[PDB]
Design brief:
Layout: E1 15-20, E2 29-35, E3 45-51, H1 59-75, E4 84-88, E5 95-99, H2 106-111, H3 132-151, E6 164-166, E7 172-174, H4 186-191, H5 196-211, H6 223-231, H7 244-253, H8 264-277
Helix pairs in contact: 3-5, 3-8, 5-7
This protein binds ligand TZ0.
Length: 282
Amino acid sequence: ELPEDPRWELPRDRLVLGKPLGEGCFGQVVLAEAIGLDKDKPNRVTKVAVKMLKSDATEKDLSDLISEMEMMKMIGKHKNIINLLGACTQDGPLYVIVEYASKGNLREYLQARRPPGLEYSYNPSPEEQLSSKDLVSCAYQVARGMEYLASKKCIHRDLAARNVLVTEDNVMKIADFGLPVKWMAPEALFDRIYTHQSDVWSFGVLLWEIFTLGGSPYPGVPVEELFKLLKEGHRMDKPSNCTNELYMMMRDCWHAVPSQRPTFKQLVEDLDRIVALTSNQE
Ligand SMILES: */C=C\C(=O)N1CC[C@H](n2nc(C#Cc3cc(OC)cc(OC)c3)c3c(N)ncnc32)C1
């Protein structure tokens, strides 16, 4: 009994469900083909992803899934977020249709492009390596995504490389912006205060994830201790490949006083200059 929205509705018959993209996980998300998403090209098929409830679902799981859709509707369309493409609401179980990212999440994507011969950080797949310009480009893109969300007054609350998806064209797309401790600003850990500024903290941890080609942060640090260490001014060490400039950016993102962290506007501008001066040669 969900209200019809003709801005977004797709007839179930124009949707062909393929294989699950999930690896036995949250909700369900399957690959599909959508017939005539564009009303001006109704004979073209488009590869899409489809989120639906599992068999074992509750009336809170459905309300959560509904909220998510209604929010994506309000936030609007950007290159660097996962966009809503449509929905099947009326004729059976709720389907939410979104953009397909062929290369998976950003952690996986970076891991698979690690040098094979690193004992420190092994390659668990061996895809072509990324230049340092490619890596600064990933960070620029995710920052643009977040600049947009921020401008729509959306606070992500769990920005991380897991929650960034990568397309066939290597386009970074922020996910789950409408629904872990080691990505949370201290004021989020302590006082449960979430802001654009606490998102900027998380983006710092995400820069670290990028430049470690998908490392796990604070390696060996127990969660229980984590708060105290940070209060005492503990920060992660620079990654080995990371320039001093980009480490400064991470540290700035990790300012203890929230008001002193840079904005996503500033980070975008800064990553735009950095990308342009960074070489692809290595
Ligand atoms: C349980 C499945 C899972 O965790 N996957 C990770 C990799 C696979 N995968 N998930 C998605 C997605 C999605 C998505 C993103 C949203 O962004 C706001 C909102 C959604 O529902 C309302 C769903 C995905 C995509 N898009 N392409 C490729 N693989 C994907 C399964």
